[PDB]
Amino acid sequence: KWTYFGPDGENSWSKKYPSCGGLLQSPIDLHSDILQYDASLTPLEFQGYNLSANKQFLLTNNGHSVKLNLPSDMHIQGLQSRYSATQLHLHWGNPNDPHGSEHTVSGQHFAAELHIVHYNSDLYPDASTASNKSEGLAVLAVLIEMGSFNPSYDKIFSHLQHVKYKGQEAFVPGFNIEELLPERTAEYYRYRGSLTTPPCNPTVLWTVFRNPVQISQEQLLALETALYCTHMDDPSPREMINNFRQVQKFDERLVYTSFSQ
Amino acid sequence: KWTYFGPDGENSWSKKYPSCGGLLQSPIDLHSDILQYDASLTPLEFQGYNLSANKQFLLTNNGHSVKLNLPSDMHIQGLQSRYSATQLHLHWGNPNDPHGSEHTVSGQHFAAELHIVHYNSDLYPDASTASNKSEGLAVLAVLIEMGSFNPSYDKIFSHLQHVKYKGQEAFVPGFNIEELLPERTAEYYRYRGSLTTPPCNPTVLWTVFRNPVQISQEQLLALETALYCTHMDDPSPREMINNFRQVQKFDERLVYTSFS
Numbered sequence: 001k002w003t004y005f006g007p008d009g010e011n012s013w014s015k016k017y018p019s020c021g022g023l024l025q026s027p028i029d030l031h032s033d034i035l036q037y038d039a040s041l042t043p044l045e046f047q048g049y050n051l052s053a054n055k056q057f058l059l060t061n062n063g064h065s066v067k068l069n070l071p072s073d074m075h076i077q078g079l080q081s082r083y084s085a086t087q088l089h090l091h092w093g094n095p096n097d098p099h100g101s102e103h104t105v106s107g108q109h110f111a112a113e114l115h116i117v118h119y120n121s122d123l124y125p126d127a128s129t130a131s132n133k134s135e136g137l138a139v140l141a142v143l144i145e146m147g148s149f150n151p152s153y154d155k156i157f158s159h160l161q162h163v164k165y166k167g168q169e170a171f172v173p174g175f176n177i178e179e180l181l182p183e184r185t186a187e188y189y190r191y192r193g194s195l196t197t198p199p200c201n202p203t204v205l206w207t208v209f210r211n212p213v214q215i216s217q218e219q220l221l222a223l224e225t226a227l228y229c230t231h232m233d234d235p236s237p238r239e240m241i242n243n244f245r246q247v248q249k250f251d252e253r254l255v256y257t258s259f260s261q
Numbered sequence: 262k263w264t265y266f267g268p269d270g271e272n273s274w275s276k277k278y279p280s281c282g283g284l285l286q287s288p289i290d291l292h293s294d295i296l297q298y299d300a301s302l303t304p305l306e307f308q309g310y311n312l313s314a315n316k317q318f319l320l321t322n323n324g325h326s327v328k329l330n331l332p333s334d335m336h337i338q339g340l341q342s343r344y345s346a347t348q349l350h351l352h353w354g355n356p357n358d359p360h361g362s363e364h365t366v367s368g369q370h371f372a373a374e375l376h377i378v379h380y381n382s383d384l385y386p387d388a389s390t391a392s393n394k395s396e397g398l399a400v401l402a403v404l405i406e407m408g409s410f411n412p413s414y415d416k417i418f419s420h421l422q423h424v425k426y427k428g429q430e431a432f433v434p435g436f437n438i439e440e441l442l443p444e445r446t447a448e449y450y451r452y453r454g455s456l457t458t459p460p461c462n463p464t465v466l467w468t469v470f471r472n473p474v475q476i477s478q479e480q481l482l483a484l485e486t487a488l489y490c491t492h493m494d495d496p497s498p499r500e501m502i503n504n505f506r507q508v509q510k511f512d513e514r515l516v517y518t519s520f521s
């Protein structure tokens with residue numbers, strides 16, 4: 001029953017999940033002293049991201065997150081193995097402090113953050129298996145700032161009032177997930193880190209795009225007010241707010257960039 | 262035994278020291294959204310800070326930071342109770358990322374940070390006893406940036422090579438500790454928080470001065486490279502670097518400022 005607030009919050013995770021106190025932890029602050037240009041970081045290609053509108057995909061509130069399941073024919077090409085999609089989810093703040101990205105940039109939080117989780121499907125038959133293995137997971141991260149209304153993100157947000165409580169599931173028609181990515185996807189930060197929730201496995205190759213996307217104040221307010229960590233019938237409801245982890249020590253790591261300036 | 266790096270680092274402090282996972286944890290980012298002017302916050306008076314140059318004060322490396330012992334006649338006046346000095350110490354990063362303050366300002370780290378710890382001597386006999394009690398401690402924090410050479414900080418830093426390893430100790434002749442405080446000490450942030458090291462008791466009234474001080478690039482590099490966490494005969498030595506805690510969540514709370 002880990003949480004992001006109170007006795008069971010982040011400084012206590014490592015009591016039950018030892019990797020959360022181990023090395024290579026994410027998220028981190030992306031700042032100049034630890035950035036190094038790497039010309040071998042060539043463009044990723046996003047394959048089968050255009051999910052058919054006539055198909056539908058499962059949206060679930062598991063109490064800690066809201067995730068959309070993605071099909072294994074969706075993949076990223078460019079890495080040293082194929083990585084297939086398994087799910088996407090978000091992280092965000094609260095109505096009175098809409099600053100809940102996980103990674104920060106020169107010490108500043110963005111409003112929210114989208115993660116698209118993939119696993120090495122060349123080597124493993126499912127993401128759970130991959131998650132304990134060296135470079136088993138690759139997660140793409142999109143920074144989200146308060147700005148213009150975003151119709152593509154709204155294809156997800158329009159379904160949240162239907163997965164308002166833990167254990168609830170809804171179906172989302174397919175759309176082109178590439179619409180959720182920012183401009184100039186060839187410009188990104190890359191680093192070795194971990195899951196940012198229990199069990200904090202240090203098995204993730206992170207790609208954080210350099211450019212943020214925008215969603216509106218009203219979309220952030222919906223996202224921040226729609227969802228609960230607890231079941232529909234729980235007599236001690238908890239809102240699902242401020243579901244991001246603080247940034248972590250670097251432990252001598254660098255972050256490699258595909259952009260030189 | 263706790264450290265700042267590896268399996269014994271900050272995220273595992275709460276196993277042995279449960280307050281590190283509880284309420285009112287420090288340090289925090291001081292940013293505009295959470296700042297509120299409070300006209301009640303008047304200037305502190307630093308009494309007994311001009312330490313006898315005929316007295317010596319113990320500097321020790323405890324494996325976590327370098328600390329100078331301070332005398333109980335040194336005190337802050339201006340708070341509801343008298344708070345008497347017990348020790349000062351510093352936190353810093355490393356020469357590849359030289360930004361190791363504990364508090365940040367609009368998400369930005371300073372080079373380093375000086376803390377002068379005090380305890381409520383009106384209510385408790387010594388800082389150890391106060392440290393887990395209501396209203397027990399008060400810490401002053403000075404932000405440090407690279408700039409001009411600082412003679413006064415050099416009164417401490419010139420002794421660092423004598424306290425290189427864990428368990429080593431040196432003597433520092435009294436000097437005026439107020440020389441380590443910045444300009445316009447009436448300007449400060451105040452908030453209720455905790456120790457930033459085990460046992461992380463939530464018993465600290467924090468005062469962080471608005472203005473930083475300067476030390477030279479050579480002085481900052483000395484601080485970053487002079488000390489180890491380990492004993493002299495340890496086959497696996499460890500540099501004392503990056504001895505600062507990551508900022509904590511601070512939600513539905515204000516930091517009060519003595520300035521607008």
Ligand SMILES: NS(=O)(=O)c1c(F)c(F)c(S(=O)(=O)CCO)c(N[C@H]2CCc3ccccc32)c1F
Pocket residue numbers: 062064065067086089115117127128131139194195196197198199
């Ligand atoms: N920010 S993040 O990308 O690190 C990240 C999460 F933020 C997050 F919430 C979840 S979870 O499964 O919904 C919560 C745990 O129950 C996962 N899922 C993890 C749990 C273990 C596992 C195994 C295979 C694929 C994904 C995950 C996750 F990878």
Ligand SMILES: NS(=O)(=O)c1c(F)c(F)c(S(=O)(=O)CCO)c(N[C@H]2CCc3ccccc32)c1F
Pocket residue numbers: 323325326328347350376378388389392400455456457458459460
């Ligand atoms: N950043 S800080 O101001 O919170 C702070 C420290 F950063 C730090 F390193 C120390 S310590 O004594 O050197 C190491 C054991 O905590 C202390 N000392 C505290 C620990 C408990 C205690 C008891 C009596 C006097 C001082 C302290 C500390 F208050």
Ligand SMILES: [Zn+2]
Pocket residue numbers: 089090091115196
């Ligand atoms: Zn995530």
Ligand SMILES: [Zn+2]
Pocket residue numbers: 350351352376457
């Ligand atoms: Zn300190």
